[PDB]
Every structure is written in structure tokens, then in C-alpha cells.
């Protein structure tokens, strides 16, 4: 896919990190070293991969990532309210 020629490993890594931070913003109280957090980063990598594979343009890619972030955030908010 063409648009892949203009996207670097570094950028993808950064995007993964941005995903993680958008889902669970944490200024590291030793949280990054926890297994659940690692599981989040892994999930994010999978999501990023899926979008990288599926999208047929950079814009589409960004859009899809955004959609997925939004969904995760909504779910997380709902579950937080549920657990109050």
C-alpha cells in the first residue's frame, strides 16, 4: 500500500504511545512497570497494527485510530461509572 512508504517505524511507535496515553494518561507512578499497563501497550500495538494494515490512506489511518480510541474511552468511562 502506497501511503506506507511515507510512514516511519518511529512515527508508528510514537502513535502507539499517544494511543496508550489517550487511553490511560499516567505520569508514571511506577505504573508503566505494572503488567496491566504492559497489557494496554500490547493492545494498543495490536490496534495500531490492525489500522496500519486496513487503512488505504494516512488520513483514513488517523481516522480509524481516532474512532477506536473514542470507543475505548467511552467503554472505560462507562465501566468507571459502573464501578462507582
Amino acid at each position: 500500500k502506497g501511503w506506507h512508504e511515507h510512514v516511519t517505524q518511529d512515527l508508528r511507535s510514537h502513535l502507539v504511545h499517544k494511543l496508550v496515553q489517550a487511553i490511560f494518561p499516567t505520569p508514571d507512578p511506577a505504573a508503566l512497570k505494572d503488567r496491566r499497563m504492559e497489557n494496554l501497550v500490547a493492545y494498543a500495538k495490536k490496534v495500531e497494527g490492525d489500522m496500519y494494515e486496513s487503512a488505504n490512506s494516512r488520513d483514513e489511518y488517523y481516522h480509524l485510530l481516532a474512532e477506536k480510541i473514542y470507543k475505548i474511552q467511552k467503554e472505560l468511562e462507562e465501566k468507571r461509572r459502573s464501578r462507582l
Binding site: 490511560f24 507512578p29 496491566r36 499497563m37 497489557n39 493492545y43 475505548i72 472505560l76 465501566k79 468507571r80
Partner: peptide, 20 residues
């Protein structure tokens, strides 16, 4: 499988949130 993975990860996040 993946929905269950998601569910798990979110649960994890909420347990982490609570503990902090």
C-alpha cells in the same frame, strides 16, 4: 477473543486506577 482481551485490559486499568 479480542473483545475478551479488551474487556480484560480495561478491567486491569480500572483495578490500577482504584489501587492508586
Amino acid at each position: 477473543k479480542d473483545k475478551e482481551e479488551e474487556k480484560a485490559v480495561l478491567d486491569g486499568l480500572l483495578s490500577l486506577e482504584e489501587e492508586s
